[PDB]
Specification:
- The structure is cut from a larger assembly and holds 2 copies of chain A.
- Chain A is an alpha+beta fold and 834 residues long.
- Chain A has 5 domains: 114 residues, Nucleic acid-binding proteins (OB fold (Dihydrolipoamide Acetyltransferase, E2P), Beta Barrel), CATH 2.40.50.140; 191 residues, 3-Layer(bba) Sandwich (Phenylalanyl-tRNA Synthetase, Chain B, domain 3), CATH 3.50.40.10; 64 residues, 2-Layer Sandwich (Phenylalanyl-tRNA Synthetase, Chain B, domain 1); 223 residues, BirA Bifunctional Protein, domain 2; 93 residues, Ferrodoxin-fold anticodon-binding domain (Alpha-Beta Plaits), CATH 3.30.70.380.
- Chain A contains 20 helices and 41 strands.
- In chain A, the strands form 11 sheets. A 7-stranded mixed β-sheet of chain A has the order 29-30-31-37-36-35-34, with helices on both faces. In chain A, strands 3, 4, 5, 6, 11 and 12 form a 6-stranded antiparallel β-sheet that branches.
- The longest helix of chain A is centred in the last third of the chain and has 19 residues.
- The radius of gyration of chain A is 41 Å and the shape is elongated.
- At the A-B interface, loops of A face loops of B.
- Chain B: Belongs to the phenylalanyl-tRNA synthetase beta subunit family. Type 1 subfamily.
- Chain B: This is Phenylalanine--tRNA ligase beta subunit.
- Chain B: Tetramer of two alpha and two beta subunits.
- Chain B: It is found in: Cytoplasm.
Chain lengths: 834, 84
């Protein structure tokens, strides 16, 4: 909402004459009480010869691209200059605005006599943009006949000492979408007397002798008031006075004819939208009714709307007159030849208009005010104000007929219910002791009825404030008018917190631990790539494909939510690689979305009570599973090139080591077992178990997934379900034996298919407590041990808890361990050593 | 009632005077203010804190409740503490 300071000032001045304030101050008072000033535009300044001219002669210049006009312009004192202009929106006899040589326009433009298109041009004719008066539309500014004689000082006629405040009103404050509302706000801020510009002293009631038009209203439509008055015999060629075309222009509304302009004006003055129907184009009774399935209307702009059974309409016997509250229709639109006007002054249902306007994408000036509730008490006053003004400009007469449907049965008092609040409740909530009676005076200033009753106020808010419904609403009023800056800064006593939880600590430690080892965290997108699972070659019944789908993504091809974090990780890996950062290791810690059924939503639960424990569990069960995952990808080098040697390319072993890092950070023990699972390589893919629960996978990616996905050769990956890794809080108590140790190295031959950790476990099982440490050294294959066998050399460190281990004692433990590997994985002793 | 404050317990009326008498002191009253002359074998009883511990230990420390105090907004750890 834009409006200009002069008008805002005029309306405040009625009740506090001589009121006036710098724009800077006004901007600050508006912010201080709740209104966002997006922008302050003082009307761009002019200097020198910028005067009204009259076009006296137009010569269409031929031979060029555009149609060009060499115009004789009467500039005062019988002085006629020729001027070149490209526009076409003006005729001989029109008052235009000319910047003559020596003038300076907004933006630092000096005008000079310039030869152009074959003739001399002594300046130019201005657009309202070039003057910084209004928005740039096509062509120049033309003034209504009689606004000014030629020669008149442009700056004075245009009123360029004005300033246009551009405000972003909040939806609770619809009443401020008008000069009426803001005026009242300013009067409240500055403790000024306020004359309501919709009061009867300012709009005397017009007579009421009979109904102005037949009207049926289906009341379940939500209409709360519907008033009509006609004006007959208006000059259709009359145009609106300069003052009125101007304030529309400053407010953002282009003028068209008095019928339309007067409604737009009174809409801005009082906040009550209005509309003008060509009465002679109405066939029969006016009907308010819902639309039917498949019904259609063409609105003013001649565009066909597909209607919805919740859109309220105005119809007649012939067709549709208005999508109520949003936009009139063509069928009754005022046109060039309209002599007799019927003026609509209605109050629609806020939620109805909101629904309808969002569906049709018609955020009209009318719609946005009805969304935020219009003061129903002023419809006839706005209708009367708007009728007199029309007759006054375009010279018709205002019939004393009047229709005024106010519901069934009629509402005669539009005041909300009274709200009941303790006199000092504002003081509590602010933490400030306001001077006595503050709270009552401020609630009176906004227009409420305040009655006292000991320590308990009874407050009936006024009809234009439907947002004032509980004491919290009343508090914000008092607090914003006194200023929020007067509220002190008092730290509250907060209780002994428990600090972070175990899982919160575990995510931090997983992050430190991976980051130190060279991984760079990304923020994964939850929106999957298109067809990623077709790229991975996942079977159609692969659980990962069962995705919760978003219904309005910012990319129509990417509407599924991630059931796995590798897609987003792999996407970031691709980005780093395409920018030359080929040696990368990324990781992420975020939830996935795995749904358990088809999207079942639970219906509304009353908000006046808290939901039951059961209603919570049902709400929780309605949502998909959303476990925390950790995941990571690696590509290129893992150790970089240097003086130490050429570096080490990423290998699947590095993804297993990522598992062990997360497990060490989580203080749990994991086992890795071979597995086939896409998108991993089948011969290099491990499944991760904590105890006997699967927590995820790790390994090198499938070479065919790599290839279809444009991924780097050899990329490795890892994903673990954190929710599947249990809490652990060890209280270790390590037995630290000081007695000497015996070191022996044993080599075992086993079938190639046997995992190294199996042989290690068997050796540990057989050797018992004496074995302090076991570690795999060598892994050797060759013909002489058998084409399908392999030789594992383990390094064993034995140590007794109470004695110096003999070296027979050790070989006892060795022999015992060798026997265990024989019985469990069929090991054969190769040999041993020290 | 200084013993009552420090313990966070409202002891039954006259407790504080009876217990200081029991240890052998001379207790004389003066409105809300006790005058306590400890006995010669108690040179450790030299300020009210000393007298508090007497009352509190005889009634039992177990009767003192467990009330978390309002602790203020801490600033948490310092940069050097974080760096270590």
């Amino acid at each position: 909402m834009r409006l200009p300071y002069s008008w805002l000032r005029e309306v405040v001045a009625v009740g506090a004459s001589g009121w006036d304030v710098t724009p800077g101050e006004l901007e600050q008072t508006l912010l201080r009480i709740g209104h966002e000033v997006e922008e302050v535009i003082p009307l761009g300044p002019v200097d020198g010869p910028v005067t009204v001219g009259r076009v006296a002669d137009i010569e269409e210049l031929t031979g060029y691209k555009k149609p060009i006009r060499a115009c004789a312009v009467d500039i005062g004192d019988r002085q006629y200059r020729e001027i070149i202009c490209g526009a076409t929106n003006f005729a001989v006899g029109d008052l235009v605005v000319v910047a003559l040589p020596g003038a300076t326009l907004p933006g630092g433009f000096t005008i000079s006599a310039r030869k152009a298109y074959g003739r001399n041009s002594d300046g130019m004719i201005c657009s309202a943009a070039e003057l910084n008066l209004g928005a740039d539309h096509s062509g120049i500014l033309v003034l209504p006949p009689g606004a000014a004689e030629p020669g008149a000082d442009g700056a004075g006629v245009l009123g360029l000492d004005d300033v246009v405040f551009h405000l972003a009103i909040t939806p609770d404050r619809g009443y401020c979408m008008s000069v009426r509302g803001l005026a009242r706000e300013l009067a409240c801020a500055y403790d000024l007397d306020f004359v309501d510009p919709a009061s009867n002293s300012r709009v005397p009631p017009l007579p009421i002798e009979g109904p102005a038009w037949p009207l049926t209203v289906q009341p379940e439509t939500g209409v709360r008031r519907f008033a009509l008055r006609p004006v007959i015999g208006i000059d259709p060629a009359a145009v609106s006075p300069w003052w009125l075309q101007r304030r529309l222009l400053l407010c953002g509304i282009r003028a068209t004819c008095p019928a339309v302009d007067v409604t737009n004006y009174v809409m801005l003055e009082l906040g009550h939208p209005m509309h003008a129907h060509d009465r002679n184009r109405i066939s029969g009774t006016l009907g308010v009714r819902f639309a039917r399935s498949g019904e259609t209307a063409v609105t003013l702009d001649g565009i066909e709307r597909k209607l919805d059974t919740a859109d309220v309409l105005i119809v007649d016997d012939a067709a549709t007159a208005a999508i109520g509250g949003v936009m009139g229709a063509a069928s009754t639109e005022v046109r060039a030849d309209s002599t007799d006007v019927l003026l609509e002054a209605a109050i629609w249902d806020p939620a109805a208009v909101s629904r309808t306007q969002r569906r049709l994408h018609l955020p009209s000036e009318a719609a946005r005010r009805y969304e935020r509730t219009v003061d129903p008490a002023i419809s006839v006053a706005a209708l009367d104000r708007c009728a007199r003004l029309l007759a006054d400009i375009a010279g018709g007469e205002v019939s004393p007929t009047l229709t005024d449907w106010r519901g069934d049965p009629p509402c005669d008092d539009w005041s909300p219910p009274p709200i009941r609040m303790g006199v000092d409740v504002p003081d509590r909530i602010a933490g400030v002791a306001y001077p006595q009676g503050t709270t009552a005076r401020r609630l009176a200033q906004i227009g409420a009825v305040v009655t006292h009753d000991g320590d308990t106020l009874t407050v009936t808010p006024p009809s234009w404030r439907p947002d004032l419904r509980q004491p919290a609403d009343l508090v914000e009023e008092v607090l914003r008018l006194e200023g929020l800056e007067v509220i002190p800064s008092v730290l509250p006593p907060a209780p002994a917190g428990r600090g972070l939880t175990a899982g919160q600590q575990r995510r931090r430690t997983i992050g430190r631990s991976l980051a130190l080892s060279g991984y760079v965290e990304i923020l994964p997108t939850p929106f999957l790539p298109a067809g990623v699972f077709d790229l991975w070659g996942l079977e159609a019944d692969d659980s990962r494909r069962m995705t919760t789908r978003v219904l309005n993504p910012l990319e129509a091809d990417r509407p599924q939510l991630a059931t796995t974090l590798l897609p987003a990780l792999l996407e970031a890996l691709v980005r780093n690689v395409s920018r030359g950062l080929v040696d990368v290791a990324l990781f992420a810690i975020a939830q996935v979305v795995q749904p358990t059924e088809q999207t079942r939503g639970v219906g509304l639960i009353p908000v006046d009570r808290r939901p039951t424990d059961d209603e919570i569990a049902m709400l929780d069960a309605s949502l998909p599973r959303q476990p925390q995952h950790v995941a990571a990808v690696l590509a290129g080098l893992r150790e970089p090139r240097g003086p130490w040697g050429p570096g080490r390319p990423v290998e699947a072993a590095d993804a297993f080591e990522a598992v062990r890092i997360i497990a060490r950070a989580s203080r749990v023990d994991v086992t890795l077992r071979p597995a086939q699972y896409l998108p991993w390589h089948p011969g290099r893919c491990a499944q991760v178990f904590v105890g006997e629960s699967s927590v995820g996978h790790a390994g090198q990616l499938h070479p065919a997934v790599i290839e279809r996905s444009g991924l780097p050769k050899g990329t490795c990956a890892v994903e673990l379900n954190l929710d599947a890794i249990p809490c652990s809080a060890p209280l270790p108590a390590p037995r630290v034996s000081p007695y000497p140790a015996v070191f022996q190295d044993v080599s075992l031959v086993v079938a190639a298919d046997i995992p190294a950790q199996a042989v290690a476990d068997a050796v540990r099982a057989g050797a018992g407590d004496l074995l302090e440490d076991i570690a795999l050294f060598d892994v050797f294959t060759g013909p002489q041990i058998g084409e399908h066998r392999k030789s594992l050399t383990f390094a064993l460190r034995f140590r007794a808890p109470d004695r110096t281990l003999t070296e027979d004692d050790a070989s006892a433990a060795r022999d015992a361990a060798v026997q265990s590997a024989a019985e469990r994985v069929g090991a054969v002793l190769r040999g041993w050593k020290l």
